[PDB]
Amino acid sequence: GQSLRTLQGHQSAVTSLQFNDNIVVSGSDDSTVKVWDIKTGQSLRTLQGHQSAVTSLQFNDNIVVSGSDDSTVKVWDIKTGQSLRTLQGHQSAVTSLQFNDNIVVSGSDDSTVKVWDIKTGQSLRTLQGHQSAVTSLQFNDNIVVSGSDDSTVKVWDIKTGQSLRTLQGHQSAVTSLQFNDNIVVSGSDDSTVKVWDIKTGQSLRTLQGHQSAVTSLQFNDNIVVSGSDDSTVKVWDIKTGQSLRTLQGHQSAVTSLQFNDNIVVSGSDDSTVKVWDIKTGQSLRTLQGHQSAVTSLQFNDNIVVSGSDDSTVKVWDIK
Amino acid sequence: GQSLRTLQGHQSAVTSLQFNDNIVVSGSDDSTVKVWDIKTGQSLRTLQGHQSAVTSLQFNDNIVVSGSDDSTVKVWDIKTGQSLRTLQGHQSAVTSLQFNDNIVVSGSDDSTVKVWDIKTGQSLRTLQGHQSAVTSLQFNDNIVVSGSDDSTVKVWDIKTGQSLRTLQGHQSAVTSLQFNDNIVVSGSDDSTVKVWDIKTGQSLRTLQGHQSAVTSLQFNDNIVVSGSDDSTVKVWDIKTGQSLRTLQGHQSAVTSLQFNDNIVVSGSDDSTVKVWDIKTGQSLRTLQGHQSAVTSLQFNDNIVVSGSDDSTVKVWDIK
Numbered sequence A, B: 001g002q003s004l005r006t007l008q009g010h011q012s013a014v015t016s017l018q019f020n021d022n023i024v025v026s027g028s029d030d031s032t033v034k035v036w037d038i039k040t041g042q043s044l045r046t047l048q049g050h051q052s053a054v055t056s057l058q059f060n061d062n063i064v065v066s067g068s069d070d071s072t073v074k075v076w077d078i079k080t081g082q083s084l085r086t087l088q089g090h091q092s093a094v095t096s097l098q099f100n101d102n103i104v105v106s107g108s109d110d111s112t113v114k115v116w117d118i119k120t121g122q123s124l125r126t127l128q129g130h131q132s133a134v135t136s137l138q139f140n141d142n143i144v145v146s147g148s149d150d151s152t153v154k155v156w157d158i159k160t161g162q163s164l165r166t167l168q169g170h171q172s173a174v175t176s177l178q179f180n181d182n183i184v185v186s187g188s189d190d191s192t193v194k195v196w197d198i199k200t201g202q203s204l205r206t207l208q209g210h211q212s213a214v215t216s217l218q219f220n221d222n223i224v225v226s227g228s229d230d231s232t233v234k235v236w237d238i239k240t241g242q243s244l245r246t247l248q249g250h251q252s253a254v255t256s257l258q259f260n261d262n263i264v265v266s267g268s269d270d271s272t273v274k275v276w277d278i279k280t281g282q283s284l285r286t287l288q289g290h291q292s293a294v295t296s297l298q299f300n301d302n303i304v305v306s307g308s309d310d311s312t313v314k315v316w317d318i319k
Helices: none
Strands: A003-007 A013-021 A023-028 A031-038 A043-047 A052-057 A063-068 A073-075 A083-087 A094-099 A103-108 A113-117 A121-128 A134-139 A143-148 A154-156 A164-168 A175-180 A185-190 A193-197 A203-207 A214-219 A223-228 A233-237 A243-247 A254-259 A263-268 A275-279 A283-287 A294-299 A303-308 A313-317 B002-006 B014-019 B023-028 B032-039 B042-048 B056-059 B064-070 B074-078 B082-087 B094-099 B104-108 B114-116 B125-129 B134-139 B143-148 B151-158 B163-167 B174-179 B183-188 B193-197 B203-207 B215-218 B223-228 B233-239 B243-247 B254-259 B261-268 B274-279 B283-287 B293-300 B304-310 B312-317
Touching: A003 B274, A013 A052, A013 A303, A013 B293, A023 B215, A031 A063, A043 A121, A052 A094, A052 A134, A063 A094, A094 A134, A103 A134, A103 B002, A134 A175, A143 A175, A164 A303, A164 B261, A175 A214, A185 A214, A193 A223, A193 B223, A203 A243, A214 A254, A223 A254, A233 A263, A254 A294, A263 A294, A275 A303, A313 B261, B014 B056, B014 B293, B014 B304, B023 B056, B023 B312, B032 B064, B056 B094, B074 B104, B094 B134, B104 B134, B134 B174, B143 B174, B174 B215, B183 B215, B183 B243, B193 B223, B233 B261, B261 B293, B274 B304
Parallel strands: none
Antiparallel strands: A003 A313, A013 A023, A023 A031, A031 A043, A052 A063, A063 A073, A073 A083, A094 A103, A103 A113, A113 A121, A134 A143, A143 A154, A154 A164, A175 A185, A185 A193, A193 A203, A214 A223, A223 A233, A233 A243, A254 A263, A263 A275, A275 A283, A294 A303, A303 A313, B002 B312, B014 B023, B023 B032, B032 B042, B056 B064, B064 B074, B074 B082, B094 B104, B104 B114, B114 B125, B134 B143, B143 B151, B151 B163, B174 B183, B183 B193, B193 B203, B215 B223, B223 B233, B233 B243, B254 B261, B261 B274, B274 B283, B293 B304, B304 B312
8 A cells, every 4th residue: 555656747636537557647727637657657748728727537549638617628649748629619617528439528517518529629419408517427329428416317319419318316416427238326415326227217226325425436237336425435235225335434525436346446535545345345555645635546456546636646556 | 686797707617706885806717816897897907826726815905815726825906906925835725715904814625724924925823633625714813713624613723823622513524614702603514504602612503404515604693594505595593403494496506695684695506696585585586697507696785796607707786
């Protein structure tokens, strides 16, 4: 659980990050995206262009796609660091995004989701229906799934731009979601996680247990893992809807999480990252070093990469 | 209940505002503070200097004091628009501030509160004790009262910098607070409002009823008025601790509120401002016009001034 290196360069809080075997890409309230060598910790490029905070990002081998409080999405050449195109259309901040080789999908405080051609920068569809800000989204080849401050999840036909169905049940804003070909899982300010049939729109299970808002979630075939403002992480049986175990140790809200078959990794407003055994619920390591809240994280077999309100990214030895 | 004028100029969301009989002062994610003529809607000055979003502000007839995600507080000459001094010392974003003619008090994501000489810009004391970000604060000539993501409220001796007492009881982050000579009133992500004896630190009443986080509050000698992510505003009897009435009408979270002896004014993620009769709980007017969430508001007897994620400030005829 040792800190390997600290990546310094951002002038304000890190809001988002992603990494692979070679590089880390971070977004910050300082309006920039930075690309780092993960082995040396050296910043390689600073992507300048956004007029206000970067809220979301994703990258592959060739490009970076970033969303910002300036209401735009930008596509970058990750090798040269130059802005390739700026996707304008949203009327307020972009809150979330995802892309593949053909399409960018963005969500905004303007209550819409927009689908863009990533090669031309042209908006293809505007998904209208939510009554307030879009907070979260995911998409595949066929559909887009969005969550909103209006407490609903909506399923859209990405080709026609039509709303297929609206999933109602949460009592306050949807904060997070994930789906596969059969199931949508959503988290909400109402402190619950809900499991939905994606084809019928029917809620199947309501996971009750958290004492305050759910901030983050992930699921697979058998289990759901959720993080909450109540400072805990909970592991749920997705079939029975029962709480399997509660992971206690953080001293304030859990802000982010990721898990695999063996390990849960959580980040918290208490400035730490914790590594947990998912089968037993036991904390294995507490990663201490950040000076303020952890905002984002990702891990693999060897390392954890975390971003913080202290403006740094840290790389950790997970063992 | 009509829109009188729309103040356009900010390039991203308005985060904070204050007004008097002549002037509106607004802060924005675009890193600027703008000063407007309230009667004509004309921007008079743009205060440029912060390197990232402005999170908080206050002004009087001579100066503006602003806090930013760039970790600084700046003091401005409101007539010339020039930066008088920059107050550096916090290690992460400034979240809250208040000043009088002698001192500035700031709260930060670095978990500290700092007291500054406003004439010289010199930090006088750093209040250390909270375990995570400070979210809210208020001070007078003797004491500072702070709320934190660590779920506590702390009372400080502003002359010595010593923590006098820690108010424990909330089960998650404190989001808002107000105090007078007798009591402290705090709101929390645990969905409750708590009333405390400020001299002894003892909790007197826990106001239970909201279904999700409390986002905003105000109180007088008789009543507490609270807003929540459950989309409602509640009026409470501060002596008995019972809910008097629930104001329903907003379609998503209430973000801000203010009240006087006759009227409650609330702002919401549903992009509207609502005016309510505080005695009957009846909504009187719904102010429609903003294109996305209302983030901040203030009102007097004649007008309401609102700021929004749509980057505008609007002035409304409250009648």
